[PDB]
Amino acid sequence: PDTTMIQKLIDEHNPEPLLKGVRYYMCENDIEKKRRTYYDAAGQQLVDDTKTNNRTSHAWHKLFVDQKTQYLVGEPVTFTSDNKTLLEYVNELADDDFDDILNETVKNMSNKGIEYWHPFVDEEGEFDYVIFPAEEMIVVYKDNTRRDILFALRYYSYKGIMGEETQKAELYTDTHVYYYEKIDGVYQMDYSYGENNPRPHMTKGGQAIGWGRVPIIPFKNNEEMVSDLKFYKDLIDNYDSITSSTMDSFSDFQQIVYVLKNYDGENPKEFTANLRYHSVIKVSGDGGVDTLRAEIPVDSAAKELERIQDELYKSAQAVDNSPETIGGGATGPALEKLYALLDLKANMAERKIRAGLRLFFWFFAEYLRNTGKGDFNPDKELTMTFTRTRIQNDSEIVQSLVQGVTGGIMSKETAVARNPFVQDPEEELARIEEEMNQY
Amino acid sequence: PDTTMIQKLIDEHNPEPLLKGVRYYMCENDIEKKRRTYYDAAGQQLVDDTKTNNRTSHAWHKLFVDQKTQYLVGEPVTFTSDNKTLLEYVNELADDDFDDILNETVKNMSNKGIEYWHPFVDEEGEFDYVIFPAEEMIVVYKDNTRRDILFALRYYSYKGIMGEETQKAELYTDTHVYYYEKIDGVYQMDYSYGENNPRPHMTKGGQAIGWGRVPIIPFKNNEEMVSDLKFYKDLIDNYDSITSSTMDSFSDFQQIVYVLKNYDGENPKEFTANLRYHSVIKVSGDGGVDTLRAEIPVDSAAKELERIQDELYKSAQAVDNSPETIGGGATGPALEKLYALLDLKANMAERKIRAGLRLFFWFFAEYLRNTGKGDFNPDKELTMTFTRTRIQNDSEIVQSLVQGVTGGIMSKETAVARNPFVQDPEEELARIEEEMNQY
Amino acid sequence: TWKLASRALQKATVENLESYQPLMEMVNQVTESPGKDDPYPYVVIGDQSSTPFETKSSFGENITMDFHVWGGTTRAEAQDISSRVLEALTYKPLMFEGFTFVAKKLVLAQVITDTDGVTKHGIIKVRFTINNN
Amino acid sequence: MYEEFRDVITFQSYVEQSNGEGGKTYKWVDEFTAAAHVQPISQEEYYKAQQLQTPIGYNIYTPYDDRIDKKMRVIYRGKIVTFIGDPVDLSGLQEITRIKGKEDGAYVG
Amino acid sequence: MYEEFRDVITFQSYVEQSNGEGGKTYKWVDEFTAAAHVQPISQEEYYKAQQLQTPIGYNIYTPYDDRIDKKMRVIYRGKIVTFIGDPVDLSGLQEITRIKGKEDGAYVG
Amino acid sequence: QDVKYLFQSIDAATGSAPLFPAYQTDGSVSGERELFDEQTKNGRILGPGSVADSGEVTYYGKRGDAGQKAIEDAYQNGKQIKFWRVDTVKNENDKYDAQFGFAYIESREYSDGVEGAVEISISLQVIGELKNGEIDTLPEEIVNVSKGGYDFQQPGQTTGE
Amino acid sequence: QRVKRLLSITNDKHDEYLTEMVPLLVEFAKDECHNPFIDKDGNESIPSGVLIFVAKAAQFYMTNAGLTGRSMDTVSYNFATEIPSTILKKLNPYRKMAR
Amino acid sequence: QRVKRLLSITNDKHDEYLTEMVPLLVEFAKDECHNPFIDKDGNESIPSGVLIFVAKAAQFYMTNAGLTGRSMDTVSYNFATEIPSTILKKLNPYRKMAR
């Protein structure tokens, strides 16, 4: 694609949506309000200098997400590969990386922004995923295939060591990802002729390889438009704003006006200086009527705000009351009950399995196919099993086991068996042996 | 990097964010309000002298964090090393330091600020981590690799013994960390030519060694933007402000104005002195109307404040009712229930495992690789096991055991076994032996 | 005799009137005639106690003019001019065409009353005789 | 309320009298043209005596028009009158000439 | 209302007559120039007798104008008339002379 | 010594024709008042204008008197007529002087007598006085001009018969 | 009235005099922010309260002063005082103009 | 009225006299903070209440005093008192000017 063509595409697309999130994350946009304004003769709204711009945000997201990820990932019962060689590797680890990668990959896409992920080759050459803020360029496909966009470029200004700003644009190819620095502006970063650097997203055999996957295409907001972030976030966004506003509100939005009908003092140039010096305000002649500040609205505002805050939480609608909780009610379901916050996530997590997170497994199988065997599906080895499960509560089994041992032989294996942690009764044996030995 | 270039980088970056936290921690910025102002003829806002600057803050953070760290760290079931030699050491301790270090390292990064951690060599040469307030310099990479910033410098003024202020800047290299004192300003602290002091972050073999890790890069606020601090902190920040404000409020914000429409006394120079002497305020002629204070707003403010205070608690947010608690409900889940505060942390704690705290283990494996063996992954010794778990309640098992012993042989081993504390039945044996002996 | 000229002599008097600037300026038609009421000074001119008497005869060959002055109209003006000339002449006494001018025994009288308390008014009577009857 | 006024008006002045002539000769000169406004007392219309008079002497209020009055005849409405009683601006937010008095006191010897 | 008034015409008085000369000699002096305000006596305008009043006297109120009135001729905008009613600060914020009364006792002998 | 006015008058003064004598006694009425003679002045306005205080005459008559009737006729006409006047005092017939004088036609009431010889009295009076107006002079010359001479000085001798 | 009359009126005649007089007192006291009662340009403006008083007073005063316009000498003049207009202004009929 | 008239007016003539008089009483009493009713410069300012009274009184007084301006001798003069203007000022028509 010509540089010009490449450059053009980006401009058309609106940078805003990715940027907004980023800006929002850093802070909410007070600016959007931004502030109270006054009407000129023109009547065009102008922001007053006086009003300050304040915003706060959470930052709720992080806490929940991390928990979500950990819970979701779980540990695979077993991992298998289509290829024997891959399978051997895959069995052993079995694959800490794989699970993490898949979870991360799915998680990232699900999570904000993303919105769009563009693979880049790692130095290792192992697939590495990074997220960059949207330029955002409008996606277009150089290639005939409309559906895919072979190439998308994003150009963002970067501060150098010097900190001088130069426009930088990156060229993306389906086959390879390119990074360009265009200091001159005359040319994109060299070459890049082709497969040679910038490197292809992934290379196989030490040679550039193409996934054959459709090149990254921006994600439209989902109809569900539900995100892990979203679930809290909807409540949170209100919650944060309200909390932040409340603290500010009391001091703020006087803010701060003093008006008296009468009576003017010496001409205000003198007046201001003297007035401060004299200090205190006195009224003479006509009133003397109560003035703007602090005034009633200090109290009123507090009252109003208090109502507002209560409502504001309700807008969050997380819930007025502290958890009963419904469960606890200690049971197996108790655990589900235990994390209300997590539970909502859990549905999503479960959803992910529905999502084709499992499909990713199929993808792995596809990967497996790619390498070879070629032509079989070793992916399932005579069975397919997935377990969340989680069948057993850790506590309950353990507690039972201790009592059980005297009465009869427990577990030892049984709790183990599900994994199975180990077939070997030996661990069990020792317990028994002690009993026999004793005492 | 030239000194000038080095110096330049810092200035660009905005010192504020790290500083703000520090200042905030010491105190909230009352200044931000700062105080009620008056409008001059210019109308530019000027802070009045009269208004005092008051701020309070918590200081909530510390209590929760410490608990978090302790809980999170747990005790490793076992520790292993790739290298036999390392493994031997690692088994034995197994490694109090390692766990602490990892937990601390992860914890620190997670915790405020951090935001950015820059390793420095310890005198011991063991990796030591310290956090310094941001200068903050803008990170730039001297080296070609854009992604990493080989060198970042921070320069902060320091008070000497003399207490004279001199600018001090530190030079950081990926390979080595440098500290410079620039009293003269002509030159940075000597030399520092290179590997020679300031020392490299870490040295191996008694020789300078490079981690090869990407040099410290500032952390952007996370999208999750959740911190251990944050979880309480969001509630806390409101809570502290409200609590602090309330106490001040009652006395404060009169504050303190007396205004009578009439009638003036002798000219105020005389007036002030005499008025105090006479004491008491009398009104004659025209009213005599209630003056600014106490006036209605004493009552009004009280009313307003009362609403505010009530809202205030809510604004900070907490369960209005004391904990049911949902659990207790004594059960295994009861423990989870028991620490509501901890529990939120716990999710983060669990999250950390998801985080790649485990990854750190891999890193350790990498470290293990670095030393040798070279080429194998001894890191997992025929298994990988992690246990939070925590499977067993201490109380329940113990209680069961006592009863159990008469009926049958318990535990003794069984409770032990999970660790296993010790295989040896011997401890169990004594209990049995006594029974046999008895009596 | 002429006849034409007797008119002319009368004309001469007219000529005198024109000849006398101050007459026009001075007059001073007021008071004499109403305007007596008007504030002092008010000068009125008229005969003294004059009511027509005798019939089928000329009133008199001589013509007499009476002045009553409060505020003193141009008694002075006339008096100055007349006096100057009369003194100037002084004689011979006027005679017209051999006729005997002389008036009989003259008359003098004066009385003043001032309601206002204004200084006393004076009355001057002048009689002129022209030609013998 | 009149505003700029009057318009084109002509004034005649009467000065000097002629004597020594059976007829009277009068010379008149034009006066500067200005609005003249005058208000008839028309007497109080108590008119206790009610004997008189027509003001000679019609008491006049003319804005900034001193000149026309007295020692001049002003022709408004065509009519001609001579003025006496040097001007008095009793009224007239701008100085106005008035005529005062009527000629000849009624009281007669 | 009036404000500082521009009296273009300066008061000129005519006094004394000359006699004994074929011509007449007159001396006129301008007492001074100043604006003046006077209200017409305009008679009582009860007009009970109403034979009078014809100024003098005049009723004049002229601020801070000593000079204008008689033993000085009154000229307003060049109008000339002579007056009596030796002066009086009848009423005016700044000292204004006025004239009282009428000349000549109407009551006559 | 011839003292006689003489009578002759056709009509005009002195009659301009000889007649036998008749006499006027004598008399001067007045001439006190102004009295107006023929005034001579220059640059003077005549005045008072013609007026006569009056006139007086006494008459005497003789058998031959004529024009007595004429006078009555004259009266109707009322034409102004004048007389001459004779003083005594050595009035020689030619010699005697005369005054210029005045009179009226009008008054002649009647004529009277006893036995001896007729006497008539005539009085002369100017009509007046208007303030203005004068002859003045002419009848003032005439009215002592007519009878009354220096006239008929010779006929003073006559009427002898 | 007439233009001449308007001019003759002192207040009208001196815009400056009238214009200056009120604000001298007015300017310093009022708020005094000052509530500028002026544009940034500094063109004068008059407060509403000031305007009502000023307008009435200014109009009244000129009329009251005269000339036309002045009370009659002959009798003490009801009109000039009346009814009394000064009194009309005082306690101006709305009353304590403002509340 | 006329400039001369304005000057002749005592109050106008003596700015100082008028200016001084009110504040003497005014200054000490009012708040007395003092509510300075003055600039730091010390340029005088007048309280609103003071201004209303002062303005009316000052204007009235000069007019009332005279000269022009003074009541007629001939009869007791309704005008000067009237209607009565002093009364107009007193109980000034808004009433108890202030509330």
The residue extents of the domains of chain A are: 1-439
Exposure pattern of E13-46 as b/e (b: 16+ CB <10 Å)?
beeeeeeeeeeeeeeeeebeebbbbbbbbbbbbe
Contact H79 G77 (CB under 8 A): yes
Whole domain around residue E88: which residue ranges?
1-109
Contact A251, B32 (CB under 8 A): no
Compute the distance between CA of residue A342 and CA of residue A354 in angstroms, rounded to an integer: 18
Contact with chain G for residue A265, Cβ under 8 A: yes
* Tokens (6 digits) for F63: 């058998």
Look at residue A299 and give its three-state secondary structure: helix
Verify H-F touch: 3 or more CB pairs within 8 A.
no
Structure tokens at B438: 């008895």
Residue with tokens 């450059």: A7
CB atoms within 10 A of CB A129: 16
Question: What three-state secondary structure class fits B387?
Answer: coil
Report the number of secondary-structure helices (H) and strands (E) in chain E: 0, 6
Chains in contact with G, counting 3 or more C-beta pairs less than 8 Å apart as contact: A, B, D, E, H
- CB-nearest to H29 from B259, B262, B270 is B262
Cβ atoms within 10 A of the Cβ of F46, count?
25
| Residue ranges in F17-152 assigned as alpha helix (H) | 68-77, 137-142
SS3 A278: helix
Using a CB–CB cutoff of 8 Å, tell me whether A289 touches chain H.
no
Angle at H58 between CA H53 and CA H60, to 5 degrees: 95
With beta carbons less than 8 A apart as the criterion, state whether H1 and G10 touch. yes
Q: Do H67 and E92 touch (CB under 8 A)?
A: yes
Q: Does E60 touch chain D (CB under 8 A)?
A: yes
Task: Say if residues A215 and A292 touch (Cβ distance below 8 Å).
Answer: no
Which DSSP helix (H) or strand (E) runs through C122? strand C122-128
For residue B44, with 0-12 CB atoms within 10 Å meaning exposed, 13-18 middle and 19 or more buried, which class applies? exposed
DSSP state of B222: P
Technique used to solve these coordinates: cryo-EM
Q: Which residue has the tokens 């603290």?
A: A247
For residue A416, which amino acid is it?
V
D19 chain-C contacts, CB cut-off 8 A: 17-18, 20, 23-24, 27
Residues 4-63 of H with CB under 8 A from G: 5-6, 37-39, 43-48, 51-52, 55-56, 59-60, 63
Contact flag for E and B (3+ C-beta pairs < 8 Å): no
> Which has the closest alpha carbon to F130: F52, F78, F56, F30?
F52
Q: What CATH number corresponds to the domain at position E91?
A: 2.40.10.270
Give the Cα separation of B249 and B261 in Å (integer).
Answer: 27
Among F100, F127, F129, F143, the residue to mutate for chain C (most C Cβ within 10 A)? F129
User: Which chain F residue shows the shortest CA-CA distance from C101?
Assistant: F34
Contact B266 H28 (CB under 8 A): yes
Q: Is C68 an 8 Å CB contact of chain D?
A: yes
How many other CB atoms are there within 10 angstroms of residue A90's CB atom?
Answer: 20
Report yes or no: B260 and H31 within 8 Å, Cβ to Cβ.
yes
What are the tokens at A146? Answer: 């409309």
Distance from CA of G80 to the nearest CA of H (A): 7
Instruction: Note down the domain range covering H62.
Output: 1-89
| Residue A165: its H or E element | strand A165-170
Rounded CA gap, F120 and F113, in Å? 8
Whole-angstrom Cα distance, residue B129 to residue B118?
Answer: 7
Tell me which long-range contacts B198-204 makes (C-beta under 8 A, separation of at least 24).
B198/B121, B198/B171, B199/B120, B199/B121, B199/B125, B200/B121, B200/B173, B200/B175, B200/B176, B201/B119, B201/B120, B201/B121, B201/B127, B201/B175, B201/B176, B201/B177, B202/B119, B202/B121, B202/B125, B202/B126, B202/B127, B203/B121, B203/B125
Nearest to A224 by CA among A348, A50, A341, A366: A348
What DSSP line would sit under B123-140, residue for residue?
A: SS-SEEEE------PPP-
Provide the β-strand partners of residue B158. Answer: B166
User: By three-state DSSP, how is residue B39 classified?
Assistant: strand
Contact B39 G33 (CB under 8 A): yes
**Is the Cβ pair H43, A286 closer than 8 Å?**
no
User: Helices in A35-167 by DSSP H: which ranges?
Assistant: 61-73, 84-93, 96-110
| Inter-chain CB proximity H28 and B260 less than 8 Å | no
Q: Are E74 and E82 in contact (CB under 8 A)?
A: yes
- The structural domain count of chain G equals 1
β-sheet bridge partners, residue E28: E14
CB contact under 8 A, G95 and H93: yes
Using beta carbons and an 8 Å cutoff, which residues of H are at the interface with B?
26-36, 98
The CA distance from B137 to B154, in Å, is 6
The total of structural domains in chain E comes to 1
- Determine phi and psi for A262, rounding to 5 degrees: -145, 165
**B42 in contact with G, Cβ within 8 Å:** no
> What's the rounded Cα separation, in Å, for the pair C45 and C27?
12
| Integer Cα distance of A323 and B222 in angstroms | 29
Task: Tell me the C-alpha distance between C44 and C124, whole Å.
Answer: 12
- CB distance from D103 to chain C under 8 Å? yes
Which residue, chain included where needed, has tokens 């799915």? A106
G99 lies in a domain? Answer: no
Could you report how far apart the first and last alpha carbons of chain H are, in Å?
34
Q: Which residues pair with A207 in a beta bridge?
A: A204
Are the beta carbons of G34 and B41 separated by less than 8 Å?
A: yes
Q: In the numeric block, which tokens belong to residue F112? A: 């009277």
Name the residue among A302, A50, A264 with its Cα closest to residue B253.
A302
- Give the C-alpha separation, B260 to B275, whole Å: 14
Residues of chain H positioned with their CB less than 8 A from the CB of B275? 32
Between chain E and chain H, the number of residue pairs with CB atoms below 8 A apart is: 60
Residues 6+ apart with CB under 8 A from B84: B373, B378
Residue that is written with structure tokens 């003596």 in the block: H14
Q: Residue G68: list chain E partners with CB under 8 A.
A: 1
Short-list B396, B326, B345, CA closest to A394? B396
* CB distance G98 to A286 below 8 Å: yes
C-alpha span between A177 and B423 (Å, rounded): 57
Using CA coordinates, name the residue in chain H closest to G50. Answer: H52
CA distance B316 to B323: 17
State the Cα–Cα distance between residues E103 and E83, nearest whole angstrom: 9
Distance of CA A349 to the CA centre of its chain: 14
In angstroms, what is the resolution? 7.2
Distances (CA, A) of G90 to G46, G60, G87: 20, 12, 5
Any chain H CB within 8 A of the CB of A281?
Answer: yes
Q: Quick check: C133 and F40 CB within 8 A?
A: no
E13-15 and D96-97 beta bridge pairing: unpaired
Q: How far apart are CA A438 and CA A430, in angstroms?
A: 12
Contact H7 E94 (CB under 8 A): yes
For residues H4-43, one letter each, b for 16 or more C-beta atoms within 10 angstroms of the residue's C-beta and e for the rest, the string is bbbebbbbbeeeeebeeebbeebbbbbbbbbbbbbbbeee
Rounded to whole angstroms, the Cα distance separating B224 from B217 reads: 19
Buried b (16+ CB within 10 A) or exposed e, H81-93: bbbbbbebbeebb
* Residue that the structure tokens 């700003």 belong to: A165
Q: CA A263 to CA A287: how far, in whole Å?
A: 8
Beta strands per DSSP E along F22-134: 23-24, 59-60, 111-112, 119-120
**Residues C28, A248: Cα–Cα separation, whole Å:** 100
Q: Is A418 exposed, middle or buried (0-12, 13-18, 19+ CB in 10 A)?
A: middle
CB contact under 8 A, D93 and G69: yes
The number of helices, as runs of H, and strands, as runs of E, in chain B is 14, 8
Our CA-based measurement puts residue H61 at a distance from the nearest CA of chain E, in whole angstroms, of 11
Interface residue of H20, H22, H25, H34 to substitute, partner B, most B CBs within 10 Å: H34
How far F55 CA sits from the closest chain C CA (Å)?
A: 13
Q: Which residues pair with D62 in a beta bridge?
A: D97
Can you tell me whether residue B55 is helix, strand or coil? coil
CATH number, domain of H57, equals: 1.10.246.150
